[PDB]
Amino acid sequence: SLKYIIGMDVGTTATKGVLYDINGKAVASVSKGYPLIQTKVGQAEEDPKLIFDAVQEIIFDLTQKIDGKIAAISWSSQMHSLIGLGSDDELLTNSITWADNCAKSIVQDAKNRGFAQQIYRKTGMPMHPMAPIYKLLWLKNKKTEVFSQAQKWIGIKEYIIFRLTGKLVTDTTMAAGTGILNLKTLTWDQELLDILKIKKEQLPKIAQPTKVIFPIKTEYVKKLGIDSDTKIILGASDGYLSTIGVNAIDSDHCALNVGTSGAIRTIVDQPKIDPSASYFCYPADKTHYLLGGPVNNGGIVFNWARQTLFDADETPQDFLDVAQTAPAGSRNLIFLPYLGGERAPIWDANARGSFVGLTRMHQKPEMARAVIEGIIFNLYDAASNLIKNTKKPVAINATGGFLKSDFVRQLCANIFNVPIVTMKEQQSGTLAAMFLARQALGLNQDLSEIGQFAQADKVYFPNPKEAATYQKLFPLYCEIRNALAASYGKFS
Amino acid sequence: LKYIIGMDVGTTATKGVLYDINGKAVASVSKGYPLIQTKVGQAEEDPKLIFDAVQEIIFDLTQKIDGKIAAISWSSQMHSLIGLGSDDELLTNSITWADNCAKSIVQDAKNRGFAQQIYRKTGMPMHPMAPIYKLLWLKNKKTEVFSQAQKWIGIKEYIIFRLTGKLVTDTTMAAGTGILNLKTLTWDQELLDILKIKKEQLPKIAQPTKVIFPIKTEYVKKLGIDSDTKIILGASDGYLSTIGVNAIDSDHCALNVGTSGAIRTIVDQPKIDPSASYFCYPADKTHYLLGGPVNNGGIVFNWARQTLFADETPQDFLDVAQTAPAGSRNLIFLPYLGGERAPIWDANARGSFVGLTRMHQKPEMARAVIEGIIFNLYDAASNLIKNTKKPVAINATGGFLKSDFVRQLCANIFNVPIVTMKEQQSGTLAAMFLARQALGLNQDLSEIGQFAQADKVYFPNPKEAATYQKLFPLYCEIRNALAASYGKFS
Numbered sequence: 005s006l007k008y009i010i011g012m013d014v015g016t017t018a019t020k021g022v023l024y025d026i027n028g029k030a031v032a033s034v035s036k037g038y039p040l041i042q043t044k045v046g047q048a049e050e051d052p053k054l055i056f057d058a059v060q061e062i063i064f065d066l067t068q069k070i071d072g073k074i075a076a077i078s079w080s081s082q083m084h085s086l087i088g089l090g091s092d093d094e095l096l097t098n099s100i101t102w103a104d105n106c107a108k109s110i111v112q113d114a115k116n117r118g119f120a121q122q123i124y125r126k127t128g129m130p131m132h133p134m135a136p137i138y139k140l141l142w143l144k145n146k147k148t149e150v151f152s153q154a155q156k157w158i159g160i161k162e163y164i165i166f167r168l169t170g171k172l173v174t175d176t177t178m179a180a181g182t183g184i185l186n187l188k189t190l191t192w193d194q195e196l197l198d199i200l201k202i203k204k205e206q207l208p209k210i211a212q213p214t215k216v217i218f219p220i221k222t223e224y225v226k227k228l229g230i231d232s233d234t235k236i237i238l239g240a241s242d243g244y245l246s247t248i249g250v251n252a253i254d255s256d257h258c259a260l261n262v263g264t265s266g267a268i269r270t271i272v273d274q275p276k277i278d279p280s281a282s283y284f285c286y287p288a289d290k291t292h293y294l295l296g297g298p299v300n301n302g303g304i305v306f307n308w309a310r311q312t313l314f315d316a317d318e319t320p321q322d323f324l325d326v327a328q329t330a331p332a333g334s335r336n337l338i339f340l341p342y343l344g345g346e347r348a349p350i351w352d353a354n355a356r357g358s359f360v361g362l363t364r365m366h367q368k369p370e371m372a373r374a375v376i377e378g379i380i381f382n383l384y385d386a387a388s389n390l391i392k393n394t395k396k397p398v399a400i401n402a403t404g405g406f407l408k409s410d411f412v413r414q415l416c417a418n419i420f421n422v423p424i425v426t427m428k429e430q431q432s433g434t435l436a437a438m439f440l441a442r443q444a445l446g447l448n449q450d451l452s453e454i455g456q457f458a459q460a461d462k463v464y465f466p467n468p469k470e471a472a473t474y475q476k477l478f479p480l481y482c483e484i485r486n487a488l489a490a491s492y493g494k495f496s
Numbered sequence: 497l498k499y500i501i502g503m504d505v506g507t508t509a510t511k512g513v514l515y516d517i518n519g520k521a522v523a524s525v526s527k528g529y530p531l532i533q534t535k536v537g538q539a540e541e542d543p544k545l546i547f548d549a550v551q552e553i554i555f556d557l558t559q560k561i562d563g564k565i566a567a568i569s570w571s572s573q574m575h576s577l578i579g580l581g582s583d584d585e586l587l588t589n590s591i592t593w594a595d596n597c598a599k600s601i602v603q604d605a606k607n608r609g610f611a612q613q614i615y616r617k618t619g620m621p622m623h624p625m626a627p628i629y630k631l632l633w634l635k636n637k638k639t640e641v642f643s644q645a646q647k648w649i650g651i652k653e654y655i656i657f658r659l660t661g662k663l664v665t666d667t668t669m670a671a672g673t674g675i676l677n678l679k680t681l682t683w684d685q686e687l688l689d690i691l692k693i694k695k696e697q698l699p700k701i702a703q704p705t706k707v708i709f710p711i712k713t714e715y716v717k718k719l720g721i722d723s724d725t726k727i728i729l730g731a732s733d734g735y736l737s738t739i740g741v742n743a744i745d746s747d748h749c750a751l752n753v754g755t756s757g758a759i760r761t762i763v764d765q766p767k768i769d770p771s772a773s774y775f776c777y778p779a780d781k782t783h784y785l786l787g788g789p790v791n792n793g794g795i796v797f798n799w800a801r802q803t804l805f806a807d808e809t810p811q812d813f814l815d816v817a818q819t820a821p822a823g824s825r826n827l828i829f830l831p832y833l834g835g836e837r838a839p840i841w842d843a844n845a846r847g848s849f850v851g852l853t854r855m856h857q858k859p860e861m862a863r864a865v866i867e868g869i870i871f872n873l874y875d876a877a878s879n880l881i882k883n884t885k886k887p888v889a890i891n892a893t894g895g896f897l898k899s900d901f902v903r904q905l906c907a908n909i910f911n912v913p914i915v916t917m918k919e920q921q922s923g924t925l926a927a928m929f930l931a932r933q934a935l936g937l938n939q940d941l942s943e944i945g946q947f948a949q950a951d952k953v954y955f956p957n958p959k960e961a962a963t964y965q966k967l968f969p970l971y972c973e974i975r976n977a978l979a980a981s982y983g984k985f986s
């Protein structure tokens with residue numbers, strides 16, 4: 005008779021579930037991982053059966069923790085995944101994740117003929133192999149057999165929900181990650197379907213994130229430890245949910261998350277695409293569009309620098325301590341952070357990192373700090389593509405392990421020159437999934453109400469003096485990036 | 497029993513070496529003197545201080561033996577500039593090659609096409625180290641002292657003048673003023689007129705082997721020598737370091753890398769570079785020193801040793817770098833930390849690591865520094881020898897070249913044998929040799945080989961040489977990409 009909501013987050017490498025009480029308070033969480041399938045270089049698949057097994061296990065463990073009813077289970081999910089089902093609804097492929105680069109040549113050719121540009125103009129999908137549309141084109145050319153027998157092309161969230169309810173439905177924000185969803189109609193682009201040789205019937209139907217998918221099959225009602233009145237809430241993408249999950253529900257705010265990798269995002273009231281296709285535009289509904297830049301080179305690069313500049317015994321705190329002994333701007337040392345190639349803002353998979361501007365004045369602290377500043381400059385570079393000459397947002401709602409320290413929080417404030425707002429809850433995705441459930445159940449109505457759950461913790465205002473230093477130094481960062489932009493192909 | 501003293505009048509210190517009659521060094525002594533840096537770019541020294549050190553050293557060396565000093569010969573720093581007044585007293589300190597006062601004057605001359613003209617005429621690269629540019633600067637902003645200067649000379653000239661009363665320079669030293677005409681081997685009249693300087697205000701020019709006599713009696717006593725002790729005019733450190741490693745003709749190259757570095761070769765006629773990337777300094781009618789002075793040698797190694805790593809010894813650094821593959825997984829290090837002269841001639845240059853990946857760990861970065869220092873020297877050497885036959889070997893010296901590792905690396909990158917020398921002190925050795933020529937004890941320059949012996953030889957490993965041959969174009973691509981970006985870091 006006490007009611008609860010479970011929010012699920014179906015990520016690459018692991019799913020996390022959070023159990024929330026009817027006041028929105030998290031009362032427990034459980035997560036379980038699965039291996040990535042990387043036989044060959046560029047390969048990045050996972051077994052949908054394993055993921056679904058983790059899902060049942062997580063939900064069961066959560067329900068074991070309480071004596072009450074699960075009113076709803078809502079979903080946040082990785083984007084861009086692709087799975088083929090045959091006519092018997094059986095798996096024809098693994099889940100081909102966003103990180104699989106099998107379509108990389110397909111994209112390059114599309115880019116040369118002006119096709120990738122057209123897909124971007126139609127769907128808001130950047131010219132990158134992560135998209136289902138490019139993977140489908142690759143499959144159709146190089147794996148004719150499976151392409152022939154595929155009757156459904158879906159993502160992992162659709163797969164999971166299908167196993168639970170026998171229904172095949174995707175939400176708008178997830179269709180937004182296929183590269184097939186038309187920005188203006190918010191249904192599949194007919195021209196692109198024709199080129200794909202895919203029929204609308206071979207794709208899930210599109211509904212709103214709050215749609216209740218009912219009923220769950222009795223089998224799984226038992227296995228999951230739930231009621232026959234437990235609802236499935238369709239849910240949404242991790243990108244969208246992570247954004248509203250930090251209360252960045254409109255264009256006055258941006259969401260900056262930086263963990264191993266990073267992302268800058270904002271929600272606008274109409275489709276808006278970039279002439280240089282430097283950021284994605286993923287619809288959420290007719291009056292909300294998610295703009296953003298996924299950025300590879302976040303804390304993963306901080307980690308590389310920590311181990312390389314020092315040694316594998318240097319703590320993150322030790323590194324930060326040393327970096328802080330250099331002046332703001334690192335005496336003009338520039339670090340381009342593109343260690344793993346880069347998506348936003350430069351969209352060059354061959355890019356590599358650089359230190360430029362060294363002199364005998366640059367000692368360890370200058371190099372350490374340049375790394376941190378470069379990481380943030382890169383993010384500000386991506387953010388600046390979004391904003392352009394529009395209203396600067398009045399705050400950046402910030403999360404992620406790279407932004408743990410006050411030093412980095414303040415540095416972001418100083419470089420972005422807007423206040424940085426940290427959040428009480430880092431698990432923004434399950435939180436916002438939980439919120440969609442509350443909407444479906446009639447417990448909340450307007451989106452803005454998520455603010456009561458997604459609460460702000462600390463605010464960091466730009467220090468005017470340092471902000472000026474960084475404002476003068478950013479153009480030099482861009483000069484060095486520009487100078488080297490055409491030089492990366494050489495390294496390989 | 498007769499001995500010869502070879503003197504090396506360097507920046508910050510002078511070193512004397514006493515050689516016996518068979519060219520064997522039997523003792524040495526050195527004395528330092530402060531650099532005068534009141535402001536940025538300034539690099540002066542007090543010539544009286546230097547001359548004091550010279551006397552002490554010579555006296556100290558004489559106190560080490562029972563015999564005669566047959567001769568005292570000179571190897572000297574280049575590009576120094578001292579002005580004397582009508583009373584012959586110092587109007588200025590020795591303004592060394594490192595002094596930057598004339599940097600603006602050079603930039604302007606370079607824009608007007610005059611700096612190019614100076615290079616065409618004299619073989620002097622477009623750089624403020626040159627007396628000619630320092631004179632132009634003085635003429636326009638130190639007009640007082642410019643007005644009263646009756647003699648413009650260098651430190652070697654000052655010393656010999658104090659000892660002897662005679663103002664004499666040798667060809668190799670004249671070659672470093674930026675006023676000596678390549679074709680005539682005398683002061684360039686057109687340049688003299690622009691400077692508004694009369695041939696009389698400059699030392700006479702003589703052969704490096706010319707005996708200057710007599711020595712003033714006051715110094716014969718002070719120095720501990722004889723009335724027949726000969727002063728040999730001597731020559732520049734650059735020229736003497738080259739013949740002092742037995743690199744006497746175009747079939748050889750001299751590579752020295754200590755704190756800084758230099759690549760040099762001697763050819764039989766004037767040769768200048770369309771891009772002016774190397775100097776051409778006459779020694780005589782049929783011998784011209786081509787070279788690149790390279791700032792970023794062991795000084796950059798030392799920076800990396802401390803910055804990348806603690807208190808790593810040089811050997812630890814070497815050990816770590818050797819755990820990286822040849823080519824450092826294609827990581828490029830442009831080593832221009834202190835700006836650069838040869839080969840890029842950009843005082844605003846800075847260093848870079850370009851091509852970083854998570855594959856690049858401490859070993860790759862350490863190794864890329866060493867490869868980059870060497871690539872930079874190979875870049876400068878390549879300017880020298882283009883459109884010519886490669887030298888048959890590189891004659892190598894310097895603390896940076898101490899380890900077999902770096903020696904072998906030089907072989908692999910240059911793709912020519914590296915011959916290391918028994919004698920690192922090439923300058924005073926060649927200075928001593930000059931004295932032997934003047935004393936009649938040697939005739940042909942080629943006989944310097946009897947004294948400057950090879951110690952070891954390193955032959956290119958064809959496998960690694962191939963690797964580096966493929967990597968050098970990438971090093972140049974990155975250098976080229978960034979060449980125009982340095983002015984922005986001010």
Ligand SMILES: Nc1ncnc2c1ncn2[C@@H]1O[C@H](COP(=O)(O)OP(=O)(O)OP(=O)(O)O)[C@@H](O)[C@H]1O
Binds near residue numbers: 262305
């Ligand atoms: N004190 C610190 N300052 C800056 N960065 C740090 C610090 N400590 C750890 N990191 C970085 O934080 C990163 C991980 O961030 P995070 O904790 O948000 O995990 P994630 O894997 O990116 O996302 P999630 O665990 O929610 O799935 C690493 O890449 C690491 O180098």
Ligand SMILES: Nc1ncnc2c1ncn2[C@@H]1O[C@H](COP(=O)(O)OP(=O)(O)O)[C@@H](O)[C@H]1O
Binds near residue numbers: 754793798814896
């Ligand atoms: N084992 C080594 N390997 C490479 N470089 C070294 C090594 N040891 C010292 N160095 C470098 O040697 C240089 C000095 O060269 P050296 O010829 O001995 O002195 P100098 O140029 O002042 O006459 C320094 O700049 C230092 O970093």
Ligand SMILES: CC(=O)[C@@H](O)[C@H](O)COP(=O)(O)O
Binds near residue numbers: 352353
């Ligand atoms: C080829 C390789 O190095 C990969 O790690 C790849 O480049 C991924 O980079 P992007 O996600 O930016 O295209």
Ligand SMILES: CC(=O)[C@@H](O)[C@H](O)COP(=O)(O)O
Binds near residue numbers: 834835836837842844
């Ligand atoms: C020392 C510093 O100020 C640098 O600018 C350096 O002096 C460059 O001089 P070079 O012209 O010899 O490269």
Ligand SMILES: O=C(CO)[C@@H](O)[C@H](O)CO
Binds near residue numbers: 082
């Ligand atoms: O484009 C995106 C979302 O911003 C991808 O990088 C994410 O990894 C999806 O899970």
